[PDB]
Amino acid sequence: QQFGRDIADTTDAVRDPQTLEILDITPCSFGGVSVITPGTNTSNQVAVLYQDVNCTEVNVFQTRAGCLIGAEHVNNSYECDIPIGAGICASYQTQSIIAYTMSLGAENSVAYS
Amino acid sequence: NNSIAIPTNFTISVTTEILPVSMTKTSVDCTMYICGDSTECSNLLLQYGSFCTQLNRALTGIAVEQDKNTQEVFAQVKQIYKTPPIKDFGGFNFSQILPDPSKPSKRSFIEDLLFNKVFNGLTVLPPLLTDEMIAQYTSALLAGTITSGWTFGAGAALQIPFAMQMAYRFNGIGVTQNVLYENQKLIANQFNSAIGKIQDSLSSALGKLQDVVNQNAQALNTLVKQLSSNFGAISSVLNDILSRLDPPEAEVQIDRLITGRLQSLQTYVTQQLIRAAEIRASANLAATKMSECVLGQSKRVDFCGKGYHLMSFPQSAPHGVVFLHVTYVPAQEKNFTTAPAICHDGKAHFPREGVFVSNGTHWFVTQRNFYEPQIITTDNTFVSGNCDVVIGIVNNTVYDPLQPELD
Amino acid sequence: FNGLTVLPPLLTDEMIAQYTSALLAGTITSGWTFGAGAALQIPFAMQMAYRFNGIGVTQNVLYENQKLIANQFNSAIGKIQDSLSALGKLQDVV
Amino acid sequence: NNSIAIPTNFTISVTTEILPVSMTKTSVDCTMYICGDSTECSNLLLQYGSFCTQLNRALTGIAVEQDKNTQEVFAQVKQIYKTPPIKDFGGFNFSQIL
Amino acid sequence: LQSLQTYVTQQLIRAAEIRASANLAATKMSECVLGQSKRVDFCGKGYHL
Ligand SMILES: *[C@@H]1O[C@H](CO)[C@@H](O[C@@H]2O[C@H](CO)[C@@H](O)[C@H](O)[C@H]2NC(C)=O)[C@H](O)[C@H]1NC(C)=O
Ligand SMILES: *[C@@H]1O[C@H](CO)[C@@H](O[C@@H]2O[C@H](CO)[C@@H](O)[C@H](O)[C@H]2NC(C)=O)[C@H](O)[C@H]1NC(C)=O
Ligand SMILES: *[C@@H]1O[C@H](CO)[C@@H](O[C@@H]2O[C@H](CO)[C@@H](O)[C@H](O)[C@H]2NC(C)=O)[C@H](O)[C@H]1NC(C)=O
Ligand SMILES: *[C@@H]1O[C@H](CO)[C@@H](O[C@@H]2O[C@H](CO)[C@@H](O)[C@H](O)[C@H]2NC(C)=O)[C@H](O)[C@H]1NC(C)=O
Ligand SMILES: *[C@@H]1O[C@H](CO)[C@@H](O[C@@H]2O[C@H](CO)[C@@H](O)[C@H](O)[C@H]2NC(C)=O)[C@H](O)[C@H]1NC(C)=O
Ligand SMILES: *[C@@H]1O[C@H](CO)[C@@H](O[C@@H]2O[C@H](CO)[C@@H](O)[C@H](O)[C@H]2NC(C)=O)[C@H](O)[C@H]1NC(C)=O
Ligand SMILES: *[C@@H]1O[C@H](CO)[C@@H](O[C@@H]2O[C@H](CO)[C@@H](O)[C@H](O)[C@H]2NC(C)=O)[C@H](O)[C@H]1NC(C)=O
Ligand SMILES: *[C@@H]1O[C@H](CO)[C@@H](O)[C@H](O)[C@H]1NC(C)=O
Ligand SMILES: *[C@@H]1O[C@H](CO)[C@@H](O)[C@H](O)[C@H]1NC(C)=O
Ligand SMILES: *[C@@H]1O[C@H](CO)[C@@H](O)[C@H](O)[C@H]1NC(C)=O
Ligand SMILES: *[C@@H]1O[C@H](CO)[C@@H](O)[C@H](O)[C@H]1NC(C)=O
């Protein structure tokens, strides 16, 4: 067996003819580029993310939606303004673009007895 | 003409309803799909105008709609309610559906079972709300409906003991509170039994949700597999045609591949639009069901399950919701003899809220849905006219409380 | 035709009519109880009394206007045949 | 600001409402319609991928939901109830719909 | 092929409408026939019996 392919007949595994060693095949990262604008009426400081691209091969933040550059992740939590994905979304709060996880709402412990 | 059937017992039954709410978000790239790193194909593709802004626009609209579906169905509660550490719900046991913070993603037993039970120019965009956030929406909904009843949908949550809430619900169906309070233990026991039986049936089905996933997957596989079709050209590959023929002569042979791939992409987008319309209809139904069966009772029959609706619980699924409708099903009926009215002292009497029944010798007034004989007095009866116009009148006595005690 | 075929419906018109008859009989005899469990019989006049009570009218009105109400219902049912002896919403589909 | 009108009589009215529930289950064979059973046309057509399979699957799905529509509209009873032979219905006469 | 594809697309679009109508009819059969509906103008004009 020289090479292996999975479903969609994608050749994904081969054996080198010299060492007789089996290897893997993985297409290098491809994806889209999306801008996160707070509107030209307000500012011009934009941010960019690269969908499902590890950004070791592209200040910088890594999400499940990709890697987002140009905004600083805050470990606070607010209400969603510009959706991004994976529960993380960005807003324009003081002066710069920030990225945070969504807040679903306030917590209540109803006085049940 | 004079026979009625009145139930003497009842059964609490919990039944599940599964309903798709969303579908996977996808996007395509014309340049990478039709051409795939080939400048000549890109040069020829611009001859067709803007046939590749429209496809991206359609797919983007589908994706945004997909996020809005979940947002409408689930995020119907403004706050996140928590169950108390101590759980004394009058004997009712919600440990199967209540979220537990001892496992992964704060899910419940039934949600865990329910989740276990189910390249080249293509991307699958992640959903906006992760499974954990949908889980805490569902947990908030259950906590609110357990602690407050239906008050948290109309405004501020107002706590109420669970047994009193179930008495409210029984009163809504048309059964008095004493029916709940006199046999609370039986009702709690059979509710627990039913909620364990649904667990067993699910452990051993969920086809409506799987169908959507399968159908999307097969559509995408067809789209990918359509790339290797010749479409009446020399060969499928764009290198085997450019690197073997004169470009002025291979220009005509490229157009077949471009047209075929454009047709395939257009067909895919049209099917996705129709399927998204259907999934949106289903999501709107799910949102209505949430607002009407979870945030309150429903008088609409067969809308929140078979039987007389009491209350419902939502559960998050891989791409949908699961409603556990608990209903009141009357059973063990026995048949009596009725009469529209009672003529006493030449005067017609009608039941205030029940019906007149007789076990053969005596007459009673019982509520319509549960057998509770009562003595026909003037307190549970009103008078209109005289006993000469109503057909089917019978004769007996009506008790006035004042006379026996006065003397 | 040229490779065109029309399949037969799974349910014959006979069995659809039989479902409709079963629903009619259940409504006439047992009231609305048969949709929520077992069918429980009740005389039709008392079921109409329930249904008058459902729209905010005291049940005595039915029991003292039974004859008039029955006559009105029979006349209104009779007028349907005349109004039929229309279905454009069904004809447009075919 | 102090006038009310109370009805003193009533009328029983019957109206008709008509709704479609299903279509005809029509199927088309892509190969026979496109080519009309000539071998070379079939050979040239099968260079086009799986358009015919897609069309056939879509039509089959339409037919299946056509059956499901009728099944969900009409099968809302478990037993098959029967009217008693005696027609004592308080004076109401259902003889035209039974 | 284009003619056949057009026919199938219009068939899908028409089937969607027929399914909406059938869902409404099933709702009416549940709510007006198996019970009495308080919703106005859903089961005719006037108070529903
Ligand atoms: C109503 O039904 C319940 C159960 O459906 C009956 O309770 C059962 O009673 C028998 C004998 O007393 C026991 O052996 C069962 O274990 C009971 N079942 C449950 C779930 O507790 C109850 O007796 C019935 N009531 C009437 C009036 O018949
Ligand atoms: C509520 O129900 C749950 C499960 O039905 C109970 O938890 C289990 O109870 C069984 C029977 O006693 C034990 O064998 C298990 O060890 C329990 N834990 C599990 C399955 O994780 C729970 O005890 C019930 N609530 C109350 C107050 O008894
Ligand atoms: C409803 O009550 C009536 C009252 O007798 C029952 O009628 C008879 O019931 C016996 C019991 O099995 C049958 O053998 C007869 O054939 C019935 N009809 C007669 C005597 O005319 C009837 O069975 C009861 N139904 C239910 C479900 O309890
Ligand atoms: C119908 O129910 C009534 C309920 O009051 C029965 O009348 C009493 O039945 C008990 C049962 O043994 C007797 O001890 C009483 O003497 C009866 N009268 C009164 C005033 O309480 C009646 O017997 C029942 N009839 C049938 C045929 O079961
Ligand atoms: C209900 O009671 C009235 C009053 O007693 C009954 O009317 C009597 O009927 C008897 C029998 O024919 C006559 O002898 C009396 O003259 C009637 N008196 C009056 C004031 O009408 C009536 O028949 C009873 N109904 C039933 C069904 O028993
Ligand atoms: C209420 O309306 C009904 C008809 O809708 C009236 O009944 C009619 O009365 C007149 C005169 O009394 C008769 O000539 C008709 O034959 C009756 N029609 C029917 C169908 O019986 C009734 O009079 C009206 N008023 C009251 C108080 O009921
Ligand atoms: C219910 O209505 C039908 C028709 O409106 C009645 O059928 C008629 O009955 C009379 C005898 O009363 C015959 O002379 C007619 O020829 C019948 N017409 C038909 C069958 O079309 C039927 O009698 C009514 N039901 C009752 C119980 O009277
Ligand atoms: C648009 O700009 C005006 C002027 O700076 C500002 O008042 C307004 O709030 C802006 N609108 C936004 C930020 O939506
Ligand atoms: C991304 O790349 C880094 C370095 O190659 C690696 O450690 C990491 O596991 C990769 N994936 C994610 C999700 O960070
Ligand atoms: C936010 O707080 C958490 C607390 O555990 C910490 O781990 C994280 O590094 C903090 N991040 C920032 C940006 O302050
Ligand atoms: C119902 O039928 C029986 C059968 O004889 C009859 O005696 C009775 O009077 C009828 N009911 C009415 C209200 O007329």
mmCIF file of N, CA, C and O and ligand atoms in Angstrom, chain B residues 333-335, chain C residues 41, ligand 3:
data_model
loop_
_atom_site.group_PDB
_atom_site.id
_atom_site.type_symbol
_atom_site.label_atom_id
_atom_site.label_comp_id
_atom_site.label_asym_id
_atom_site.label_seq_id
_atom_site.Cartn_x
_atom_site.Cartn_y
_atom_site.Cartn_z
ATOM 1 N N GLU B 333 -62.901 5.302 34.697
ATOM 2 C CA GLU B 333 -64.218 5.916 34.626
ATOM 3 C C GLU B 333 -65.312 4.887 34.878
ATOM 4 O O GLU B 333 -65.194 3.721 34.501
ATOM 5 N N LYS B 334 -66.380 5.331 35.532
ATOM 6 C CA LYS B 334 -67.563 4.516 35.744
ATOM 7 C C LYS B 334 -68.787 5.361 35.439
ATOM 8 O O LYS B 334 -68.772 6.579 35.615
ATOM 9 N N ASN B 335 -69.847 4.716 34.967
ATOM 10 C CA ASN B 335 -70.956 5.430 34.350
ATOM 11 C C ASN B 335 -72.180 5.500 35.250
ATOM 12 O O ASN B 335 -72.592 4.497 35.835
ATOM 13 N N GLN C 41 -68.879 9.145 27.436
ATOM 14 C CA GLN C 41 -70.136 9.563 26.839
ATOM 15 C C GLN C 41 -70.820 10.624 27.689
ATOM 16 O O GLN C 41 -70.589 10.738 28.892
HETATM 17 C C1 LIG F 3 -70.923 2.134 31.408
HETATM 18 O O1 LIG F 3 -71.993 1.814 32.286
HETATM 19 C C2 LIG F 3 -72.940 0.915 31.671
HETATM 20 C C3 LIG F 3 -74.031 0.673 32.692
HETATM 21 O O2 LIG F 3 -74.423 -0.692 32.762
HETATM 22 C C4 LIG F 3 -72.275 -0.381 31.166
HETATM 23 O O3 LIG F 3 -73.226 -1.069 30.360
HETATM 24 C C5 LIG F 3 -73.079 -2.503 30.459
HETATM 25 O O4 LIG F 3 -71.859 -2.918 31.096
HETATM 26 C C6 LIG F 3 -71.690 -4.342 31.167
HETATM 27 C C7 LIG F 3 -70.417 -4.589 31.941
HETATM 28 O O5 LIG F 3 -69.473 -5.318 31.169
HETATM 29 C C8 LIG F 3 -71.658 -4.944 29.765
HETATM 30 O O6 LIG F 3 -71.563 -6.359 29.882
HETATM 31 C C9 LIG F 3 -72.922 -4.569 29.003
HETATM 32 O O7 LIG F 3 -72.845 -5.042 27.662
HETATM 33 C C10 LIG F 3 -73.124 -3.051 29.024
HETATM 34 N N1 LIG F 3 -74.314 -2.646 28.275
HETATM 35 C C11 LIG F 3 -75.612 -2.908 28.537
HETATM 36 C C12 LIG F 3 -75.938 -3.711 29.772
HETATM 37 O O8 LIG F 3 -76.497 -2.502 27.794
HETATM 38 C C13 LIG F 3 -71.008 -0.098 30.359
HETATM 39 O O9 LIG F 3 -70.265 -1.290 30.107
HETATM 40 C C14 LIG F 3 -70.131 0.885 31.117
HETATM 41 N N2 LIG F 3 -68.910 1.178 30.387
HETATM 42 C C15 LIG F 3 -67.741 1.392 31.000
HETATM 43 C C16 LIG F 3 -66.570 1.668 30.107
HETATM 44 O O10 LIG F 3 -67.633 1.358 32.222
#
